[PDB]
Ligand binder design. Structure first.
Ligand SMILES: [Mn+2]
Ligand SMILES: [Mn+2]
Ligand SMILES: [Zn+2]
Ligand SMILES: [Zn+2]
Lengths: 136, 137
């Protein structure tokens, strides 16, 4: 399980798992959205009455640092979060902004090709597909 | 041809070409960098003593709107600009931010595949490749 593994990964970097830090994870696993802190907040305010939104935004910043989630920094504005379940391409709606998952290998090529044509130690690549829902 | 065609396209949407508006283009064609307003500014302050940075930032915003240049919005603070041609790929330096340009036909595949697996009216795609120089340079 993705819970099981992730929970051990926290232990590994030190991070102790309080009941709320757990609740945030279980949510990130189950919710096949790409939620923002506030969606996590209002979903979990439960239940966790004394937890602030910044605190969500902090736990997430912990999880990010220990490679248990990616921060979709784009853009503006508020930030979205995936879960490094891996991996993974993003198709976004130009209108509502929803984020269907989808996979496509491969893929390299560049890495490999550009590495050739530019003389660059290629770290990784980012690929986004844009369109519309579903309408929306 | 580069200039010739572009100059005609301004004429097309109406936009009149003053000496400075011209100087900006010739620069954008010649400089196979992906300059920012300020690189264009300090390069052309010349020569064009009375033209402000915002003015550059405006003519470029004109050129953008009439599809003669793309604005590399990413990111944070300053914006980069690339004189549109065809059609087109970017590999970025994680250290100094240099932008080479490569080409990988193609393409698509998805676009097409995703369109199938998600039920989307796929407009376009964006692809960057990240690495390091060259060391840098
Ligand atoms: Mn995703
Ligand atoms: Mn380019
Ligand atoms: Zn939509
Ligand atoms: Zn570099």
């Amino acid at each position: 399980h993705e819970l099981k593994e992730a929970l051990e990964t926290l232990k590994e970097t030190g991070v102790r798992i309080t009941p709320q830090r757990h609740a945030i994870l279980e949510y990130l696993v189950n919710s096949m959205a790409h939620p923002t802190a506030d969606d996590i907040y209002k979903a979990l305010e439960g239940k966790f009455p004394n937890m602030s939104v910044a605190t969500v935004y902090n736990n997430l910043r912990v999880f990010r640092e220990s490679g248990l989630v990616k921060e979709l920094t784009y853009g503006d504005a508020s930030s979205r979060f995936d879960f490094v379940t891996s991996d993974h391409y993003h198709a976004i709606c130009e209108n509502c902004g929803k984020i269907v998952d989808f996979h496509y290998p491969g893929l390299d090529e560049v890495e490999q090709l550009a590495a050739h044509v530019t003389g660059f130690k290629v770290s990784h690549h980012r690929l986004e597909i844009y369109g519309v829902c579903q309408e929306c």
